[PDB]
Amino acid sequence: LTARLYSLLFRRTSTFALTIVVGALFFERAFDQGADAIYEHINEGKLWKHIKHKY
Amino acid sequence: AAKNVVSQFVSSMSASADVLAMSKIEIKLSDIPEGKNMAFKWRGKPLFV
Amino acid sequence: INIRKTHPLMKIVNNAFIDLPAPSNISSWWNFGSLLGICLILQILTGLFLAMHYTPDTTTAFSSVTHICRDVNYGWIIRYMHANGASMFFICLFMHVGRGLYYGSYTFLETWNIGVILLFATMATAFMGYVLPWGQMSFWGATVITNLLSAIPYIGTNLVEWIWGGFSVDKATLTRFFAFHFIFPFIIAALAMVHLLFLHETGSNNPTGIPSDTDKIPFHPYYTIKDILGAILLILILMLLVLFTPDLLGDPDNYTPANPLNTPPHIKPEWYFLFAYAILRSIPNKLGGVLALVLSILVLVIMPLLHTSKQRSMMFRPISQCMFWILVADLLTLTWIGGQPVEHPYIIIGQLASIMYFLIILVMMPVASIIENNLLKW
Amino acid sequence: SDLELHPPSYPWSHRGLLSSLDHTSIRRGFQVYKQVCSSCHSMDYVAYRHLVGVCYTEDEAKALAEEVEVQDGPNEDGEMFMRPGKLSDYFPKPYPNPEAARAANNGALPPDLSYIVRARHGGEDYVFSLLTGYCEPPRVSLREGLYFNPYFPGQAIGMAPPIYNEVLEFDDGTPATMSQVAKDVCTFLRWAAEPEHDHRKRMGLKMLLMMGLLLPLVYAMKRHKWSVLKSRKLAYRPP
Amino acid sequence: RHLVGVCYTEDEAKALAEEVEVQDGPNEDGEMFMRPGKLSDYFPKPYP
Amino acid sequence: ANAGDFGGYYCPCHGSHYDASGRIRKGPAPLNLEVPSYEFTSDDMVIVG
Amino acid sequence: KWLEGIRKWYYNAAGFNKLGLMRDDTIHENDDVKEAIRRLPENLYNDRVFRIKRALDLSMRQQILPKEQWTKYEEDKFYLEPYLKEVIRERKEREEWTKK
Amino acid sequence: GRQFGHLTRVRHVITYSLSPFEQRAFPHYFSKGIPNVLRRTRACILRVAPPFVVFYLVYTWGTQEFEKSKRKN
Amino acid sequence: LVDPLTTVREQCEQLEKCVKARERLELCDERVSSRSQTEEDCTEELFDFLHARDHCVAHKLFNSL
Ligand code: HEC
């Protein structure tokens, strides 16, 4: 849970750099998904995508 | 030589020649009704009548 | 032996950022050195992008700024970073000065004087930058402060027609202030290096004022992550200010174009220069007003010459502590009075606030100090 | 007099700390501005390419631009003919000169509506109450050349009240009261003032999720590396 | 005004610049109007 | 114009109470208003320099 | 006299009996005070640097000592004042010899 | 001000320091932090705030007197 | 056309502050009708009435609109 994580990705340094790059990309993907989800969830209605769907 | 170079740079920062091309005008007062002010641009400042 | 302790660059980096002996006691108030440094390089970078998209002429300056804030990608956030970074820059500058005045760090002489010269330079730079957008407030601010320079007899009027670039605020004034605003922060960076050099000569301070020669800890990696924490807090304050209420501090009256005929009623600085403008219009005399302003910042020069106490900090002197908080509330009162119109209660308490400012500094600090020197049998 | 009046606090749809504008309301306000307010004022810095993705589609943008023919350069002859204008034009200025603007009104330069939201004390609520509260003076007659409206420094505007109950009757049902046209033109002026309110609120939301993430954790690293000095202990041995 | 000290006096160059129309900008009503022009005028553009 | 406390010219910057004649009553104004070189020509005009 | 009551309340509320410091642990150091610190016996000097290091520790944690270890006004062993008086007297004597 | 080594002179002083991986991150952050912040607040508000309540009184009184000067008319 | 704004404005002046402002404006009308041909011409009463009325309009309008 934590012991395997330290045994894999935190003894060497290059593996730590590799996992911070891969984690930054996964965080990019999931974070932009969550950000657009929340922002077009609190402004439902008056946003240009639904008005485009009228047309 | 140093004081002449300083004098030429200070005179470079003084003014221009086309800025010194500002002179007289004639202004009309016929349009204004009672108790009111009219402004006219002259040397970069307003001009009250 | 080592890369770091022999190389000519890394000896400088070693005596700055790694093995500088810093005291183990300094609170959060000793973060604003690094916060002013990070704000200064952030101003330089974001202003450099704005200067890549800017055309300095009185015909097209406001049009070019509107072109930045509409048409260029992200020019609106870079412009808002520049303006509110100026605002947070002066917040951290006055907190830096308040630290250095309260904890008795004005017993340093040469660092303090180079500090005051940096204060002059940053104030002149931020005023020239505030002239640059070429709005109505910028036009009249340039006009009134240039006539304030014309207030002095025998030097003034020639000097002011000399820096006017003509006979009023013409094209040449906008280009002159673009060039000096676009050069002066590099001089501010060089004098900041000189400031930091005299500091690393002497040695830092601590909240007790006792010299901490026994308990120095290295700068890295304790205060480096402390300054990273301070930088993250500053960037979140700056960015919430530029992304939620960008107009909460800025002037509404800027956004009209420069008409030299109107003279709006509520003329005022941007909010950091209110007390400089409040000392001015609360004295009914021209030379007296401009001389009292210059004497205010020269009173900040004077301040090391009145350390007649025998502790160092004001941590242990409660009387001078209460008088310092009266001084802080009085400066905030001057800022509020400067940010108002001019009528009868405002006239009276503006005059009274300026008088009480000079009375607190030039009289009340040594009287509190001599009651301290008497009271503990010294 | 110089008794200014602060306009009231109106519950807008862009009032909250994360709410967005209403793009259908921006579109209605632009139809209002095309058919009412563009006869006197000017909105120099709003080009038609700003209207392509925000409210309309691209086709009606070309339609609206080819409704009004503006100007073009020489046709290798020096005659300055009329171009329909595809998308890159700014909006057509009604008056060329400021003197031309004074030469058809009682003095009274019409202010430019690109920045009237951000340029006056009080936001678009000032524009709402200025468009709304036309009433009568109790006793003060001024010259009968100007009109009375109390949300104004000087208390006498030179603008005729340009709304008066269904002058437009636009696309959908939505009958033109004073309220609908004033709400739409305030929303449109807020859009024309800040073109990027929506993307600003988007980055503000991403930033609040940032400072939800990082601020426990940079502070956790600081607490961790400073947890050596927060627990070191001392003792004094003499010989 | 460059010719005011080089190859003419002041009055002669004022005559030579009052011989030519300028088409200055607006007035109170503000279409445009021509002007003699003393010194602030360049050499005016035979083909626009 | 038409402001201050005397029915005249009020400078809003620091509070120079001038009037429609142009004389200071309270404020940091050192002198009164600036007089031009104005000369009346016959019907409606005045040369300003 | 009540001025001694003022002095006792002031030594209570001054904040340097809180951190375990005595009267002469908080003195600002110019050249004269540096000389008077260098003119000390060894045991007082070691006790002084120990109290100073405890004060910097307690202000680093911003924790202030329990009730049973505050320095009390009745046992105020101020010690640095005679050496500091001797430094001031010799300095003023040297200054007067330069003036005349 | 210089580097380490030649600053001061210390006799016998013993310093113990625990490893940072050994000890917790936040030692009792909500059983001592709240009494410490209430103690440091109670030892400062009587020297900080009585100028600021005077500023609050000046702000309210100046607002009231400007409304006094303008609300008769 | 059925205007909503005039409906809200006629239905919101029932509150006590707006009533007292209405009588303030009417007593100023009585004053300048009484001291006729004067130079004190009913400013504060009308501004205070518009202040109170438009604030109660601000409280409870945009639900309907
Ligand atoms: C021609 C008759 C106009 C029409 C149609 C509209 N406006 Fe107007 N407006 C006009 C003038 C001559 C003036 C100037 C009056 C002055 O003294 O400034 C104005 C003024 C405005 C203002 C600014 C007023 C202020 O607060 O200083 C605004 C915001 C404004 N006008 C908006 C506006 C809108 C939104 C219109 C369409 C519905 C509109 N005006 C029509 C002249 C005319």
Ligand code: HEM
């Ligand atoms: C141009 C803006 C300034 C910058 C960038 C700046 C930068 C710094 C930095 C980086 C430090 C070292 C870190 C610190 O001690 O906080 C410092 C220290 C200091 N500065 Fe400045 N400074 C500026 C303006 C001033 C001003 C105006 C003064 C007042 C005159 C001043 C007085 C001091 C003092 C007294 C110290 C030592 C503080 C201490 O050791 O505790 N500085 N400055």
Ligand code: HEM
């Ligand atoms: C050398 C570095 C700098 C550059 C290149 C720079 C560049 C610019 C430019 C191009 C502008 C015009 C854009 C605008 O007005 O928004 C500007 C404005 C401004 N600058 Fe700077 N600047 C620099 C440093 C600073 C500093 C150090 C400050 C003060 C902290 C400052 C404060 C301002 C202010 C207040 C404005 C007006 C902003 C506004 O009203 O929109 N600038 N600067």
